[PDB]
């Protein structure tokens, strides 16, 4: 290109050829000068091809390094997020009940499905119609999973508070089923 010295040789050859043409030289010198111009232009183009190739090669590695440096950052971010999620769940579980039931295991192994049944402190019931409510969680206290649960809240499908007096057979058509009942393990 302009920086490359070959441009200097090409410019010198072109200037010499132009001056000789203006000077009206014999002819053989003109042929030699046009030969010089042709060879100089060929060499300049040969070097400019390599210059452009190197330019593209340099330009196509910055993208790669930026991509790798961004992927490393994202990997660190997700690593921290997963660690924080795991450590938050550690303190959301009641340790006393879990330890008591997992020390009674013969070899330390227990089924997973019996962890919330015997250890969970809150119970959630989804009731689709009134007959199920009557047969499942009638009153302010009921029994489930060999435990006694005291009802502390009822809401409807719109997340609106419902009073236990409103839950009657005649008033059922006025409620947005299903109802979600939240209760706490008694004693």
């Amino acid at each position: 290109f302009s920086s490359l010295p070959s441009y200097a040789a090409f410019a010198t050859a072109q200037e010499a050829y132009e001056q000789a043409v203006a000077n009206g030289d014999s002819e053989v010198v003109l042929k030699k000068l046009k030969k010089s111009l042709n060879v100089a232009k060929s060499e300049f183009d040969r070097d400019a091809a390599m210059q452009r190739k190197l330019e593209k090669m340099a330009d196509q590695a910055m993208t790669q390094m930026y991509k790798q440096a961004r992927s490393e950052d994202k990997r660190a971010k997700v690593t921290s997020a997963m660690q924080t999620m795991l450590f938050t769940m550690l303190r959301k579980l009641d340790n006393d009940a879990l330890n008591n039931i997992i020390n009674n295991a013969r070899d330390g192994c227990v089924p997973l499905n019996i962890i919330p049944l015997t250890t969970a402190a809150k119970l959630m019931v989804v009731i689709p119609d009134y007959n199920t409510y009557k047969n499942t969680c009638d009153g302010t206290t009921f029994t489930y999973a060999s435990a006694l649960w005291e009802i502390q809240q009822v809401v409807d499908a719109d997340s609106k508070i419902v009073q236990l007096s409103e839950i009657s057979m005649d008033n059922s058509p006025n409620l947005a089923w299903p109802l979600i009942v939240t209760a706490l393990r008694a004693n």
């Binding site: 409807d156 499908a157 719109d158 947005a176």
Partner: protein
């Protein structure tokens, strides 16, 4: 003709209701969905028109949602 116009209109009516935030009322949205689907699967036009009357009453009930004078100008 007439049975294809009712179904295309019920689709647009349910789209309009869905923009007015009728999904916030589960009891009302369930009824609207049932009417819309029963109109789509219909073979007799009188059934479709009565169900359309029922479904448009939902829009006309919520008076403040839309102004009928400007829309019916």
């Amino acid at each position: 003709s007439k049975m294809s116009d009712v179904k295309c209109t019920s689709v647009v009516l349910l789209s309009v209701l869905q923009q007015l935030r009728v999904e916030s009322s589960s009891k009302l949205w369930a009824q609207c969905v049932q009417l819309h689907n029963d109109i789509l699967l219909a073979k007799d036009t009188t059934e479709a028109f009565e169900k359309m009357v029922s479904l448009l009453s939902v829009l006309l009930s919520m008076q403040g949602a839309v102004d009928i004078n400007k829309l019916c100008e």
